[PDB]
Write a protein that binds this ligand. Structure first.
Ligand SMILES: CC(C)c1n[nH]cc1-c1ccnc(NC2CCN(C)CC2)n1
Length: 252
């Protein structure tokens, strides 16, 4: 019922839904596991417009069948004609992003690895999150780098990072390792202040040595866009804005 036409990324393939007009699909071959798939199926019943459709789950290693989207945010940003993405297209794609995120969060599912490669862009220009529910550290939240907490704010830090990248069209924080990554981050937002530093991690606030204008790194950002971007990129997970309240920020 499926013919693998090409490999892409468990490992993701591009097949043809033989029983459904030969349309294209993305087959991923991959107790906790059983539970994770049950959640995926459960989330699918809500058929959210900003989450990739899960057309079916086959057994025999398990293969998940998703709708296939021709491109991701990276490809989209590679092809856009300078000066780049239209300010109103950024605003929209960001809203669609926050929309799917809040959906997942409302259901207590943390994406964990939100990055341009798994944020797909539809033929119609619709954002659809993928690769969740089952390396580059450029989108890792501070707390994850420090191995402190792992709640849902983690995904919002990633959103701030993607948001910046829609303007820059280049990653904001391009670290080479956990420590380098955390280093490049603090150069921008500045040292958090002992009060906001996890009290259980191995890396002391002392292992680093002041904040600077965000507009310097993200040119063309509005005042609202700048407010939102900073609320996302807040060092303390507890003080970081959520997707839900991000959907209500004046920026939108
Ligand atoms: C991240 C990806 C491997 C992926 N991981 N898990 C599911 C997908 C998935 C699901 C549905 N469509 C696409 N489309 C394309 C989007 C563009 N890239 C380059 C290939 C997959 N990918």
């Amino acid at each position: 019922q499926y013919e693998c036409v090409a490999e892409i990324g468990g490992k993701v393939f591009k097949a043809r839904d033989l029983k459904n007009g030969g349309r294209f699909v993305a087959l991923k071959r991959v107790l906790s596991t059983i539970r994770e798939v049950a959640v995926l199926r459960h989330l699918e019943t809500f058929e959210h417009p900003n989450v990739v459709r899960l057309f079916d789950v086959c057994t025999v290693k398990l293969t998940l069948v998703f709708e296939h989207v021709d491109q991701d945010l990276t490809t989209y940003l590679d092809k856009v004609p300078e000066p780049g993405v239209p300010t109103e297209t950024i605003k929209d794609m960001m809203f669609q992003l926050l929309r799917g995120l809040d959906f997942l969060h409302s259901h207590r599912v943390v994406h964990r690895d939100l990055k341009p490669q798994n944020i797909l862009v539809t033929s119609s220009g619709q954002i659809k999150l993928a690769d969740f529910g089952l390396v580059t550290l450029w989108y890792r939240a501070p707390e994850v780098l420090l191995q402190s907490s792992y709640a849902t704010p983690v995904d919002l830090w990633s959103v701030g990072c993607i948001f910046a990248e829609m303007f820059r069209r280049k990653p904001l924080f391009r670290g080479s390792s956990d420590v380098d990554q955390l280093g490049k981050i603090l150069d921008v937002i500045g040292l958090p202040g002992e009060e906001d530093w996890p009290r259980d991690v191995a890396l002391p606030r002392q292992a680093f040595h002041s904040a600077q204008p965000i507009e310097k790194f993200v040119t063309d950002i509005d005042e609202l866009g700048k407010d939102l971007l900073l609320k996302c990129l807040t060092f303390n997970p507890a003080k970081r804005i959520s997707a839900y309240s991000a959907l209500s920020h004046p920026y939108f």
